[PDB]
Write an enzyme that holds these catalytic residues in place. Structure first.
Site, mmCIF file in Angstrom:
data_model
loop_
_atom_site.group_PDB
_atom_site.id
_atom_site.type_symbol
_atom_site.label_atom_id
_atom_site.label_comp_id
_atom_site.label_asym_id
_atom_site.label_seq_id
_atom_site.Cartn_x
_atom_site.Cartn_y
_atom_site.Cartn_z
ATOM 1 N N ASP A 100 0.859 -1.194 0.000
ATOM 2 C CA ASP A 100 0.000 0.000 0.000
ATOM 3 C C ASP A 100 0.894 1.242 0.000
ATOM 4 O O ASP A 100 1.686 1.351 0.886
ATOM 5 C CB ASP A 100 -0.888 0.021 1.225
ATOM 6 C CG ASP A 100 -2.256 0.611 0.965
ATOM 7 O OD1 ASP A 100 -2.308 1.693 0.442
ATOM 8 O OD2 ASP A 100 -3.234 -0.042 1.250
ATOM 9 N N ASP A 207 -2.968 4.772 -2.071
ATOM 10 C CA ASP A 207 -3.942 5.424 -1.168
ATOM 11 C C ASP A 207 -4.235 6.835 -1.663
ATOM 12 O O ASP A 207 -3.287 7.467 -2.044
ATOM 13 C CB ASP A 207 -3.364 5.513 0.240
ATOM 14 C CG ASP A 207 -4.373 5.840 1.319
ATOM 15 O OD1 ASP A 207 -5.400 5.198 1.358
ATOM 16 O OD2 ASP A 207 -4.103 6.743 2.094
ATOM 17 N N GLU A 265 -6.722 4.519 -5.496
ATOM 18 C CA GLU A 265 -8.006 4.581 -4.792
ATOM 19 C C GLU A 265 -8.633 5.945 -5.095
ATOM 20 O O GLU A 265 -8.003 6.925 -4.842
ATOM 21 C CB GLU A 265 -7.793 4.348 -3.301
ATOM 22 C CG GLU A 265 -9.088 4.329 -2.536
ATOM 23 C CD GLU A 265 -9.048 5.041 -1.204
ATOM 24 O OE1 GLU A 265 -8.213 5.903 -1.024
ATOM 25 O OE2 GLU A 265 -9.838 4.709 -0.376
ATOM 26 N N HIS A 338 -11.201 -2.953 3.397
ATOM 27 C CA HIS A 338 -10.961 -2.589 4.807
ATOM 28 C C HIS A 338 -11.707 -1.311 5.183
ATOM 29 O O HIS A 338 -11.724 -1.037 6.339
ATOM 30 C CB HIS A 338 -9.460 -2.432 5.046
ATOM 31 C CG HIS A 338 -8.888 -1.250 4.356
ATOM 32 N ND1 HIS A 338 -8.839 -1.151 3.007
ATOM 33 C CD2 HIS A 338 -8.365 -0.111 4.826
ATOM 34 C CE1 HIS A 338 -8.300 -0.015 2.683
ATOM 35 N NE2 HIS A 338 -8.016 0.632 3.764
ATOM 36 N N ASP A 339 -12.209 -0.522 4.236
ATOM 37 C CA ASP A 339 -12.980 0.700 4.535
ATOM 38 C C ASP A 339 -14.500 0.572 4.421
ATOM 39 O O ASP A 339 -15.141 1.586 4.498
ATOM 40 C CB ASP A 339 -12.605 1.823 3.569
ATOM 41 C CG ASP A 339 -11.213 2.384 3.745
ATOM 42 O OD1 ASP A 339 -10.643 2.158 4.775
ATOM 43 O OD2 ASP A 339 -10.756 3.058 2.851
HETATM 44 C C1 LIG Z 1 -12.035 6.426 4.076
HETATM 45 C C2 LIG Z 1 -11.914 7.123 2.755
HETATM 46 O O1 LIG Z 1 -12.376 8.429 2.895
HETATM 47 C C3 LIG Z 1 -12.610 8.983 1.645
HETATM 48 O O2 LIG Z 1 -13.589 8.248 0.977
HETATM 49 C C4 LIG Z 1 -14.937 8.449 1.360
HETATM 50 C C5 LIG Z 1 -15.377 9.879 1.587
HETATM 51 O O3 LIG Z 1 -14.890 10.382 2.783
HETATM 52 C C6 LIG Z 1 -16.858 9.944 1.704
HETATM 53 O O4 LIG Z 1 -17.269 11.249 2.044
HETATM 54 C C7 LIG Z 1 -17.497 9.512 0.430
HETATM 55 O O5 LIG Z 1 -16.988 10.262 -0.623
HETATM 56 C C8 LIG Z 1 -17.920 10.665 -1.571
HETATM 57 C C9 LIG Z 1 -17.588 12.045 -2.087
HETATM 58 O O6 LIG Z 1 -17.887 12.954 -1.085
HETATM 59 C C10 LIG Z 1 -18.435 12.394 -3.285
HETATM 60 O O7 LIG Z 1 -18.027 13.601 -3.870
HETATM 61 C C11 LIG Z 1 -18.387 11.329 -4.353
HETATM 62 O O8 LIG Z 1 -17.118 11.247 -4.933
HETATM 63 O O9 LIG Z 1 -18.694 10.099 -3.789
HETATM 64 C C12 LIG Z 1 -17.909 9.682 -2.708
HETATM 65 C C13 LIG Z 1 -18.607 8.449 -2.254
HETATM 66 O O10 LIG Z 1 -19.902 8.846 -1.817
HETATM 67 O O11 LIG Z 1 -17.140 8.169 0.319
HETATM 68 C C14 LIG Z 1 -15.763 7.909 0.211
HETATM 69 C C15 LIG Z 1 -15.572 6.426 0.120
HETATM 70 O O12 LIG Z 1 -15.687 5.892 1.387
HETATM 71 C C16 LIG Z 1 -11.264 9.113 1.013
HETATM 72 O O13 LIG Z 1 -11.431 9.802 -0.197
HETATM 73 C C17 LIG Z 1 -10.601 7.770 0.848
HETATM 74 O O14 LIG Z 1 -9.345 7.937 0.269
HETATM 75 C C18 LIG Z 1 -10.487 7.175 2.222
HETATM 76 N N1 LIG Z 1 -9.807 5.903 2.184
HETATM 77 C C19 LIG Z 1 -8.371 5.750 2.334
HETATM 78 C C20 LIG Z 1 -7.752 6.843 3.127
HETATM 79 C C21 LIG Z 1 -7.270 6.712 4.328
HETATM 80 C C22 LIG Z 1 -6.409 7.807 4.783
HETATM 81 O O15 LIG Z 1 -5.120 7.288 4.918
HETATM 82 C C23 LIG Z 1 -7.466 5.484 5.151
HETATM 83 O O16 LIG Z 1 -7.930 5.806 6.424
HETATM 84 C C24 LIG Z 1 -8.379 4.495 4.473
HETATM 85 O O17 LIG Z 1 -8.168 3.297 5.116
HETATM 86 C C25 LIG Z 1 -7.889 4.512 3.058
HETATM 87 O O18 LIG Z 1 -7.998 3.340 2.350
#
Ligand SMILES: C[C@H]1O[C@H](O[C@H]2[C@H](O)[C@@H](O)[C@@H](O[C@H]3[C@H](O)[C@@H](O)[C@@H](O)O[C@@H]3CO)O[C@@H]2CO)[C@H](O)[C@@H](O)[C@@H]1N[C@H]1C=C(CO)[C@@H](O)[C@H](O)[C@H]1O
Ligand SMILES: C[C@H]1O[C@H](O[C@H]2[C@H](O)[C@@H](O)[C@@H](O[C@H]3[C@H](O)[C@@H](O)[C@@H](O)O[C@@H]3CO)O[C@@H]2CO)[C@H](O)[C@@H](O)[C@@H]1N[C@H]1C=C(CO)[C@@H](O)[C@H](O)[C@H]1O
Ligand SMILES: [Ca+2]
Length: 572
Positions: A100, A207, A265, A338-339
């Site tokens: 990752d 990520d 991602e 995992h998310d």
């Molecule tokens: C955990 C995840 O957070 C982010 O992804 C989520 C967003 O926070 C949500 O608000 C939602 O995003 C939406 C947008 O607001 C919207 O404009 C549209 O694009 O649709 C999206 C889905 O509705 O959902 C997202 C998916 O859950 C963030 O962008 C993502 O990168 C994050 N995941 C990784 C990041 C971290 C930080 O190191 C870790 O904690 C996670 O384990 C990662 O894999």
């Protein structure tokens, strides 16, 4: 640049979450020797590629996504040599392994940040995003803008010693890198990318691949939540002014120099902006995970749940399946990670033992028929469901779950109706449903550990476990093994085929075709509802032959689809 690309286009990826896969030494935390002891099992599923979630030295504020040294291993997972050994063990079994890459931010415990926060005169002060404070009409100190952190609260943390705010899109312990700084870029390329490429890994899952480049003027994010003071800035930090430049640099300096695969991602909402990332002509990355499918049943910025709109789901699948055949890009398909919450609980039914089994097969047909690279998450193959309602909020150890619940506690002054609604939100889509330990057998803690697990094991483990499904020909695990064999044998249609949506307005049945350049064509029909539905394949195909049904061919009734029945026909 002529490359070996078929291995990553056709490969099945199995994602391992190290803290929760296998504990080898009774401390309750999963570890690398444990993973090594289950590689035979991972191979036996049909896996070609292992995606290892973060295992680097880290205080685990965000379970490894807060990295304090890219070149060292989290001590509970094992020694540096344990990690070198894991790579060899994978290779020995014909398994590839990708790590990752988390470089939008580091831990606040990374030596880079300790130096950068030290002083405004430190050499690495500009390696992170430091901005001066602003003041309101009443003279009180406020942050530079309305940006909300993805994990709640303001995205700016105040450092008293240097009297400045630092940016953190994630937790306060995950300060964001200043990607305008070219010295920071070089240290990241050396420590995070080339260090591991030179030790023989097969690539990276990147990520938050779209948010490295922030806009120079850090403007206020739009009012996405009407009336809320802070606003999540995802819509304005994605594909920033230097983003493509950065990916191009990563490709030229590192990804192009080794035989690897890269999956990022987060994807843009448009076909053309997506192709800027994954078109083979762009020499940036190979494929992207889109959040669109995962968002069909909830809106995270407002923490609300909603029923799935079947037509929206059809449009969402077609949106990114379009990339295969009609472009030089690639795509991915996945229901779990995992998310996320468990797929059978969210997209099918986890109500009974019979329903859990039926649901695992149903979703296996949905995933196996999608073009692009297929991704499985540990335990998806046996149908691990969400933690049930009886599991109390205290067991949700994820920082995001804790932060959200505590925000409801504070803002509503412990309104018990608000907390119950918050709990229900988390019981459906929390990240904790993916982190409950992997379920090997019916012993204590499902045989994940000899001690006490770091996270509670889902209490359905006496029924749902690897050992109980191994020798049952009717199990979800054996259904998955079979459908992956089917996928490989018909890759022209399943992996590389073009997808078209038929019977678009049908709110109960999703019908799509998968067609290869050779002309060979499959029709796929999925009844997502709880009742039998009249369905006449002859209205969508002149000639058809049933290849398989998720409920068993002998239980398939001509003229209808049973509840959660998925079918694959060869047509034309
Ligand atoms: C955990 C995840 O957070 C982010 O992804 C989520 C967003 O926070 C949500 O608000 C939602 O995003 C939406 C947008 O607001 C919207 O404009 C549209 O694009 O649709 C999206 C889905 O509705 O959902 C997202 C998916 O859950 C963030 O962008 C993502 O990168 C994050 N995941 C990784 C990041 C971290 C930080 O190191 C870790 O904690 C996670 O384990 C990662 O894999
Ligand atoms: C009405 C709805 O009933 C059934 O759905 C239930 C599931 O079978 C249950 O297992 C349970 O699912 C919950 C999980 O246990 C839990 O882990 C949680 O995270 O989420 C689930 C709750 O959403 O409870 C469900 C009842 O809410 C049935 O299987 C399902 O088909 C039924 N859905 C109807 C809704 C649409 C409109 O979109 C119509 O097409 C049909 O009436 C049904 O499809
Ligand atoms: Ca251990």
């Amino acid at each position: 640049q002529e490359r070996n690309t078929a291995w990553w286009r056709e490969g099945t990826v199995y994602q391992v979450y190290p803290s929760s896969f296998k504990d080898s030494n009774g401390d309750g935390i999963g570890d690398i020797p444990g993973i090594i002891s289950k590689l035979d099992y991972i191979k036996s599923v049909g896996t070609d590629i292992v995606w290892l979630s973060p295992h680097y030295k880290s205080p685990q504020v965000d379970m490894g996504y807060d990295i304090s040294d890219y070149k060292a291993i989290h001590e509970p997972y094992g020694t540096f040599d344990d990690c070198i050994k894991l790579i060899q063990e994978c290779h020995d079994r014909g398994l590839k392994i990708i790590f990752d890459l988390v470089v939008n931010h580091t831990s606040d415990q990374h030596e880079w940040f300790k130096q950068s926060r030290s002083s405004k005169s430190n050499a690495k002060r500009d390696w992170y995003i430091w901005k001066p404070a602003k003041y309101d009409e009443q003279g009180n100190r406020i942050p530079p803008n309305n940006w909300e952190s993805y994990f709640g609260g303001s995205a700016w943390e105040w450092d008293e010693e240097t009297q400045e705010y630092y940016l953190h899109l994630f937790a306060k312990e995950q300060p964001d890198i200043n990607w305008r700084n070219l010295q920071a870029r070089e240290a990241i390329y050396k420590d995070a990318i080339l260090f591991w490429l030179d030790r023989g890994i097969d690539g990276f899952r990147i990520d938050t691949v779209q948010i490295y480049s922030k806009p120079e003027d850090f403007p206020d994010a739009p009012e996405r939540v009407p009336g809320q003071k802070l606003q999540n800035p995802s819509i304005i930090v994605e594909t920033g002014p230097q983003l493509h430049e950065i990916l191009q640099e990563m490709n030229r300096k590192a990804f192009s120099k080794y035989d690897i695969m890269t999956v990022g991602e987060g994807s843009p909402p448009s076909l053309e902006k997506t192709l800027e990332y994954v078109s083979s002509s762009r020499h940036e990355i190979d494929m992207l995970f889109s959040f669109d499918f995962g968002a069909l049943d909830h809106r995270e910025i407002a923490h609300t749940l909603n029923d799935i709109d079947m037509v929206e789901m059809k449009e969402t699948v077609y949106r990114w399946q379009r990339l295969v055949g009609k472009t030089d890009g690639w795509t991915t398909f996945f229901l779990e990670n995992h998310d996320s919450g468990r797929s059978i609980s969210r997209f099918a039914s986890d109500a009974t033992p019979e329903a859990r089994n039926r649901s695992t097969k149903f979703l296996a047909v949905l995933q196996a028929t999608m073009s692009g690279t297929l991704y499985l998450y540990q335990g998806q193959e046996i149908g691990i469901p969400n933690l049930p309602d009886e599991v109390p909020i205290e067991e949700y150890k994820d920082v995001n779950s804790i932060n959200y619940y505590n925000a409801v506690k504070e803002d509503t002054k412990n309104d018990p109706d608000a907390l119950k609604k918050a709990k229900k939100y988390l019981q459906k889509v929390a990240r904790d449903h993916a982190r409950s330990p992997m379920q090997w057998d019916a012993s204590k803690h499902s045989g994940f550990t000899d001690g006490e697990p770091w996270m509670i094991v889902n209490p359905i483990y006496p029924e749902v476990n690897v050992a109980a499904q191994e020798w049952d020909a009717d199990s979800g695990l054996n259904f998955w093994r079979h459908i992956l064999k089917f996928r490989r044998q018909h890759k022209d249609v399943m992996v590389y085929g073009t997808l078209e949506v038929l019977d678009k307005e049908n709110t109960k049945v999703f019908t799509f075709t998968k067609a290869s350049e050779s002309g060979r064509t499959f029709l796929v029909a999925l009844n997502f509802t709880d009742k039998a539905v009249d369905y006449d394949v002859d209205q969508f195909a002149s000639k058809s032959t049933l290849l398989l049904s998720s409920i068993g061919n002998v239980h398939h009734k001509s003229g209808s689809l049973q509840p959660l029945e998925a079918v694959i026909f060869e047509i034309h």
